[PDB]
Design a protein around this nucleic acid. Structure first.
Ligand SMILES: Nc1ncnc2c1ncn2[C@@H]1O[C@H](COP(=O)(O)OP(=O)(O)O)[C@@H](O)[C@H]1O
Ligand SMILES: [Mg+2]
Ligand SMILES: [Zn+2]
Length: 670
RNA sequence: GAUCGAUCGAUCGGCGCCGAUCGAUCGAUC
């Protein structure tokens, strides 16, 4: 099979002695083989009559599947029962029939957290070796931190029998959130205490052998100047000024709904301001139902158009003007066919008046994004120096991912590129997201073989996913903490690989330099901590654990009070009476629906039949029809309703059903 | 294999929230 290297045996030396250690090593050095060697040494040290029990806490379903596969390929020869439980498994063979019947369990932290919460698993004393893959995720309320909280509550105070040995497989301790070396050392000590670890053993003796396996790529900053002749920006700013003037003429109180003083077009500040104004416009009270409905609908349309224009301006500064124009046209086409209105027709005519000028300006070779020009130049230079490279170009947004894909596919200069999309699961407001097998089949085709030359990922290909050794780590304005910097930089580990960082905003290069200084400070702090004695560090982590336990078990009572009186749910756009609180039924605490014949004639059905408001021109989505065991009763979304009291006139808003505190009557077919 | 609803957690940016990114769990569907 595989032969253990020198550094792979050095990293597993303190773990094989019986002490809780943290294995810090660069990404791609083979920490999985170190964990396998530790598991083999742990399961072979028990005398006759007893038997160990190892649990490997993964973080992702692909990572969990890969770990289960490698553990089965490595351990089924010795005669150990390797198993794995996750979200994909069916409601059968309870965990007590799997944990008490196997030796190596590849688990997910939320499954064990739920099992310890509902009281299925008695305590963590059943296991003998817990291995947390990428233990840097131990944070304020991470499921790793919940398992560690349970372990510490079992250790401190109510001392139970033998406790399992905790071992981390992180790649970076992530001193992020700290300022100087003292705060970095404090954070490292806090993390080692939360994980109950006494050793941060790293490769120090045979460091020359590690460089022949993993190669730290050289960083390359690229500050590009913003465009000067931006006619698209000017036209969209004029349209936004016209829309804001109309909204102010119809409202007369827009300057007092938000506290934002200086709001410039095409920034996140204007987005926050317009979101606050939209959320404050839905809360209106006046003795005129039709007038209030008309005013609120007009204000909702105005703020929706302003937010869409601001999103188009934000997309225009990161991609081509054609992408922002296509986004605006798609939004206008989707909102025009929904509902025709006077304000809607006015805004559509005002937009189509400048549509020809926008089409003429966007289709200009001189009006090209300088960031995209520099990216194309870098790609040309890299693929001309070596035509066998693979790019792992990182992007912040999904819309920007699609824009970069359409730009690469539609560029005569970039004829040698075969782009690939890699997004995350779960639907969004615009995108639908990629599933697990789609991600797997796309990542399996991105390598030196072919069918793919550049993977346009977005914050998903830098956590736990195994990818081929890349030669280009261009970061299209994608920065974060020191952990994210080390994770993305660790993707390209081939011989003679670079890591480009393109940006057009003064401050991103400063943040990347701060992250590099924080990484150097983290390395210095680890080197300083690796010189302390075992007793002093054990006493320090014990004091930190005692303080954390005293702080944690003192404020864990966020108990609310349920509401009793009836409340009505008016629409969010037109503010029409939809239903009351007494008619809202709850199926299984996650299927909030409405029961009543009055509500059936208050929506229109247009995946499954998504419902919309039954008014003249509203087209506001309330919810969707779900096919239950027998019925097809529709569920609603609280993100499209406003709650109004019957006695009082308050109109507070709620983002999720958990914030809405009321008498949740359980659903009943009878 | 493809959805839907709910919930949790982490990260980034901006003024406790908002927007974005990702991960997971629980339930039902085809
Ligand atoms: N002793 C070894 N001999 C051969 N290949 C090894 C050895 N140790 C590790 N590797 C390779 O290194 C890779 C490391 O992958 P993985 O552990 O998932 O990522 P990371 O090392 O970043 O945690 C494995 O795919 C394995 O093939
Ligand atoms: Mg790993
Ligand atoms: Zn409506």
């Amino acid at each position: 099979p595989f032969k253990p290297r020198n550094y792979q045996l050095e990293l597993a030396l303190p773990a094989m002695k019986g002490k809780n250690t943290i294995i810090c090593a660069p990404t791609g050095c083979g920490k999985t083989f170190v964990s396998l060697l530790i598991c083999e040494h742990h399961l072979k040290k028990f005398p006759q009559g007893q038997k160990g029990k190892v649990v490997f806490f993964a973080n992702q379903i692909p990572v969990y599947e890969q770990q289960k596969s490698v553990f089965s390929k490595y351990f089924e020869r010795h005669g150990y029962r390797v198993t794995g439980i996750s979200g994909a498994t069916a409601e059968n063979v309870p965990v007590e029939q799997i944990v008490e019947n196997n030796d190596i369990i590849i688990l997910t932290p939320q499954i064990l957290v739920n099992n310890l919460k509902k009281g299925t698993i008695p305590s963590l004393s059943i296991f003998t070796l817990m291995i947390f893959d990428e233990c840097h995720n131990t944070s304020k309320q991470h499921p790793y931190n919940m398992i560690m909280f349970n372990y510490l509550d079992q250790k401190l105070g109510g001392s139970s029998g033998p406790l399992p040995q905790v071992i981390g497989l992180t790649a970076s301790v992530g001193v992020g959130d700290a300022k100087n070396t003292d705060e970095a050392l404090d954070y490292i000590c806090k993390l080692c205490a939360s994980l109950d670890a006494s050793v941060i053993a790293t490769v120090k003796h045979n460091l020359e052998e590690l460089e022949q396996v993993v190669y730290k790529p050289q960083k390359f900053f690229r500050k590009v100047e913003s465009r000067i002749s931006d006619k698209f920006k000017y036209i969209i700013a004029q349209l936004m000024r016209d829309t804001e003037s109309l909204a102010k003429r119809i409202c007369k109180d827009l300057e007092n709904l938000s506290q934002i003083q200086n709001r410039e077009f095409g920034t996140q500040k204007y987005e926050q301001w317009i979101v606050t104004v939209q959320k404050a416009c839905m809360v209106f009270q006046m003795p005129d139902k039709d007038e209030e409905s008309r005013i609120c609908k007009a204000l909702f349309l105005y703020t929706s158009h302003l937010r869409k224009y601001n999103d188009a301006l934000i997309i225009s500064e990161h991609a081509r003007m054609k992408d922002a124009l296509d986004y605006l046209k798609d939004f206008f086409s989707n909102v025009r066919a929904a509902g025709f209105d006077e304000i809607e027709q006015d805004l559509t005519q005002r937009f189509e008046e400048k549509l020809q000028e926008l089409e003429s300006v966007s289709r200009d070779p001189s009006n090209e994004n300088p960031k995209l020009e520099d990216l194309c130049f870098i790609l040309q230079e890299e693929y001309h120096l070596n035509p066998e490279t693979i790019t792992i170009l990182f992007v912040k947004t999904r819309a920007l991912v699609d824009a970069l894909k359409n730009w690469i596919e539609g560029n005569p200069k970039l004829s040698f590129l075969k782009p690939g999309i890699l997004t995350g699961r779960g639907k969004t407001n615009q995108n639908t997201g990629m599933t697990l097998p789609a991600q797997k089949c796309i990542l399996d085709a991105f390598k030196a073989s072919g069918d793919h030359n550049i993977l346009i990922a977005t914050s998903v290909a830098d956590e736990g996913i195994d990818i081929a050794q890349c030669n280009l780590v261009i970061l299209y304005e994608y920065v974060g903490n020191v952990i994210k910097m080390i994770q993305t930089r660790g993707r390209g580990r081939a011989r003679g690989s670079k890591c480009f960082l393109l940006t057009s905003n003064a401050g991103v290069i400063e943040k990347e330099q701060i992250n590099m200084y924080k990484e150097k400070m983290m390395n210095d702090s680890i080197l300083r901590l690796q010189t302390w004695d075992e007793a002093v560090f054990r006493e320090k982590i014990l004091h930190i654990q005692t303080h954390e336990k005293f702080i944690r078990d003192s404020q864990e009572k966020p108990k609310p009070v349920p509401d009793k009186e009836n409340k009505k749910l008016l629409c969010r756009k037109c503010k029409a009476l939809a239903c009351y609180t007494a008619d809202v039924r709850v199926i299984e605490e996650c299927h909030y629906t409405v029961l009543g014949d009055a509500f059936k004639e208050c929506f229109v059905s247009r995946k499954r039949a998504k419902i919309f408001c039954a008014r003249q021109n509203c087209s506001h989505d309330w919810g969707i029809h779900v096919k239950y065991k027998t019925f097809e009763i529709p569920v609603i979304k609280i993100e499209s309703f406003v709650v109004e009291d019957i006695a009082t006139g308050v109109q507070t808003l709620y983002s999720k059903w958990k914030d809405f505190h009321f008498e949740k009557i359980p659903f009943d077919p009878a």
